[PDB]
Amino acid sequence: GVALGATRVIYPAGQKQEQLAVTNNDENSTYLIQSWVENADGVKDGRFIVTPPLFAMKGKKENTLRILDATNNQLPQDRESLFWMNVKAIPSMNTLQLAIISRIKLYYRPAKLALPPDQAAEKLRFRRSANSLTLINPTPYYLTVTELNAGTRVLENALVPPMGESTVKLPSDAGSNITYRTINDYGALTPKMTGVME
Amino acid sequence: SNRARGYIPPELWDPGINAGLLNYNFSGNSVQNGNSHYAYLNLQSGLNIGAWRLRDNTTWSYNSSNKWQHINTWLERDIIPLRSRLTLGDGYTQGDIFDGINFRGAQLASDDNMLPDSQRGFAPVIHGIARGTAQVTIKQNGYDIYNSTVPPGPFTINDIYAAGNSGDLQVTIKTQIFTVPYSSVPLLQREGHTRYSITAGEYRSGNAQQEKPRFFQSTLLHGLPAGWTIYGGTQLADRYRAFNFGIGKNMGALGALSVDMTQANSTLPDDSQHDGQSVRFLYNKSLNGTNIQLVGYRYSTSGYFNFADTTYSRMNGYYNKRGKLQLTVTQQLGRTSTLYLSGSHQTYWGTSNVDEQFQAGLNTAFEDINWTLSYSLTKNAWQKGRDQMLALNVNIPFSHWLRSDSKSQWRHASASYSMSHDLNGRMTNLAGVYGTLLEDNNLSYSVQTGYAGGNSGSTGYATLNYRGGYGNANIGYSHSDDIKQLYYGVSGGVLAHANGVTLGQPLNDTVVLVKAPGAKDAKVENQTGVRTDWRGYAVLPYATEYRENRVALDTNTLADNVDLDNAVANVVPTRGAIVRAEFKARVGIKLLMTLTHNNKPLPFGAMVTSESSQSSGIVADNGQVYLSGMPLAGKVQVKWHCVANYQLPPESQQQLLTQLSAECR
Amino acid sequence: TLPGGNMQFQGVIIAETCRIEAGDKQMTVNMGQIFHAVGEDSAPVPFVIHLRECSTVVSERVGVAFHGVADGKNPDVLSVGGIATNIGVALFDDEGNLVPINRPPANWTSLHFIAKYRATVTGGIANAQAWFSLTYQ
What we know:
Chain C: Its main location: other. Chain C: This is Fimbrin-like protein FimI. Chain C: One of its GO terms (cellular component) is pilus. Chain A is an all-beta fold. Chain A has two domains: 2-109, Immunoglobulins (Immunoglobulin-like); 121-194, Immunoglobulin-like (Sandwich). Chain A is built from no helices and 17 strands. In chain A, strand 10 (125-128) and strand 11 form a beta hairpin. Chain A is globular. Chain B has a 32-stranded antiparallel β-sheet that branches. A four-stranded antiparallel β-sheet of chain B has the order 10-9-12-13, with no helix packed on it. In chain B, strand 26 (357-363) and strand 27 form a beta hairpin. The two termini of chain B are 58 Å apart. Chains in contact: A-B, A-C, B-C. The interface between A and C is large, with 38 and 45 residues.
């Protein structure tokens, strides 16, 4: 099998290139690894080049993917931008061929940000509508809200865009108390925070 | 015939390369008060021809207020079939059951590192009958230590990870649930596990008066079923004949008790034979708040002398021990603090001399602060001095106050404080700040001003350790009341191999010589300040022996013209093996051509190999082939034949990735 | 016995993506050779996909989806490309519910799927490729 080095890749602004580890643990296997970067909307974008785009991995061999930068400093410097790093592993074999695409997040993080990453998750606020819940995110970071419980019931994870809001379904009988967890840069759930309404 | 977890077959171990070696460690001390200059140069030679490992040590001293002294020489080797080694020449004994002595002769000892990481230490084997196919799950402290599926019939699991004291392994088959508690003593062995240290030669000691007699110190620790561990030995020599025998046991919940009786017929330099005995107990108990009680008792009978005492000079030269009780308690108060209560006691034959050595300690990890309170009562009846020392160490990292994303260099700094009260009026405190400075975290400043309380002279220090890509250096200054020392040391390592001489950081046994021709100044991953030379070779200071290491080149630091084929390589080295991990550094323009043929993009998967410059690349999609190391001209061969020409303007060299479009024939 | 000094250990631990391993090696699902009405299905063929070497935190929030070349006759069935015509490959979940292809990722440590031939008729060699995309939230 093939497994990526990290679940999310933080790209600092101005850095020439970033690396992502592609591992293979099966000795008797040949995998053609194809890679590309999509924009936030799932459309292929040529602003980030992943080299080598296509290469073959024989045996227990792991390579490093060099994510080159081609934006020419056009993304906003006051908020993060989200990109989707895609890695497809074609097995170099009436049969059905299965190719796995391990899509991960790729945050383009500008150098100068007011809020530190750790002190940004707790700044998320809440607003309870009649049958929907709105999450205000004044921090310039993308926030991944998981394990979102509104009372005794569990809601669906929402990815709140920076300086924006998202909406999730909210049952009418759910308790007023709201608690949430956020996934940090390392892919580990932060300690439980209480949800202060607005 | 199931293999153990993490098993590297003995067919993948690399003996190394026929390469030389030279490790030098200079040191200087320009004390000022009349100023005396010191210099202690240290040379460690080597020559790894074939599978043998010749070594050598040499020191040169100097004093301003010139003598080459030889120290050691040995030809170590690894005998893979017997899972052992051969330390022909100088060396020292393990001294596990006996007492360690330095010798000059052959030694054939079993090596534990050659076994996988799983079959190390003590961990009981799990037997039993599992009717039909099931899934055994070893439950311990509510954790799945070992989760596997078992075929019908009896099953043996011997790869349980050594978890120290811990608790009980509740085996959960699927459903006869039987528990297997276990404890450990350092001298216990797994089932079927054997060790031996057959030795010979002379007895070499630093003292001048001691003689150099022949001796034969053989040992053996054969594990048995049910946890018993029969271990014996024989330190037979010319005038000293010992026969150590012992038997350990894993009693499960009750703990583990190791007993060994040692009879030694010694002939002291007065030509007076002295028969004796010696009985040693090691008791280990755990999880009684988790009081880890360790008791060690060693009784002796008058006339029992170790080999170090029967090797003295004759009568014209110029109080054997009776019992040594050691008690150790480690209680964890909470999830941060751990209280230590060590203990020691001793008697002597014919005298009431009692050498008590009681040591307490309270170590805490309050948030970032790691404050340690310590207590010591070093008591010797010969001096009748309590020597009570109450020390308080503190450690306040600067990250506790600074931001997390701050670019300031202070983020690596970490303050400190070492209060040291002697309970006699003498007080000593050193309040200093240390941490790394340079961008690559090489340089380490440690300015630590200090004061002493009755003299009242302040004690200043400022060490500057630099762990560079060629050799460590440090210019450490030290100021006191009337002493103004100024250290200056230079380390390094030279590795003269087949392709040339390459300098590097001080070698630590196993080394890895990375060969990357054409790539200059590329940092290797997970190593502080290790960079390739101008030729492209670098020397890794250390690599784990008999394991699978990982050597990688940080692609960020590579030049704008160098692209690597495989940026990660793994090496499995034998002990003392200069293993070569080689990378191909393709130098040239990285161009991403949109290859087309008959106004249709080439099929996905088509191979494109250049002609003028060696390069290759598969066509990703729509004809975007990523060719590295290509010159400003040349042709490409498309095979899926077709040949395409491209012409790069001279401006292409500046651009990191020069995209072009070439129509194939 | 003399006091030493403070020693600080530094390092960072990062998570990793679950490595994908099918029970049938080389990620190949054999279907064998090749319907009174259009839409009838053939003998079921099972294959398993194991998400191993990852913690249960990541493996629970992985969004699974399917992509593939939609058949010309049936947009919701994988096309088979001497080649059998008017047929395709359909994917059914463990519960027996059809899994539409080219759909937004949905939240599903081991995943069982069944591949069945669906008629959209001539026999022949039928080869299809499926993209199994895992979004790591």
